[PDB]
Amino acid sequence: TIGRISTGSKSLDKLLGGGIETQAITEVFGEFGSGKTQLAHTLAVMVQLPPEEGGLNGSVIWIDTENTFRPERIREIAQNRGLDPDEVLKHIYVARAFNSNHQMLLVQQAEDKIKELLNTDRPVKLLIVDSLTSHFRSEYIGRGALAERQQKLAKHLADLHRLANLYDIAVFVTNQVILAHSATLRVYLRKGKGGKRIARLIGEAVFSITEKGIED
- Residues tagged in the binding site annotation for ATP: 30-37
Member of 6, 11, 34, 37 binding Mg ion (CB under 5 A):
37
Q: How far apart are CA 1 and CA 183, in angstroms?
A: 19
Cβ–Cβ < 8 Å for 48, 88:
yes
d(CA 28, CA 181) in angstroms, rounded, equals: 12
Residue 79 binds ligand GTP, judged by CB under 6 A:
no
Q: Should residue 35 be labelled a site residue for ligand GTP when binding is judged by CB under 6 A? A: yes
The answer to whether the Cα torsion of 188, 189, 190, 196 is positive or negative is positive
Largest CA distance in the chain: 52
- Which amino acid makes up residue 72? E
The yes or no reply on residue 34 touching ligand GTP (CB under 6 A) is yes
- 175 binding Mg ion? (CB under 5 A): no
Picked from Mg ion, ligand GTP, none, the partner binding residue 209 (CB below 5 to 8 A depending on kind) is ligand GTP
The contact pattern for Mg ion, residues 54-83, with x = CB under 5 A and - = no contact, is --------------x---------------
Question: What is the DSSP pairing of strand 59-64 with strand 124-130?
Answer: parallel
Which amino acid type is present at position 197?
R
Restricted to residues 123-162, the positions that interact with ligand GTP (CB under 6 A) are: none
Site residues (vs Mg ion, CB under 5 A): 36-37, 68
**Binding stretches for ligand GTP (CB under 6 A):** 30, 32-38, 68, 70, 73, 176, 209
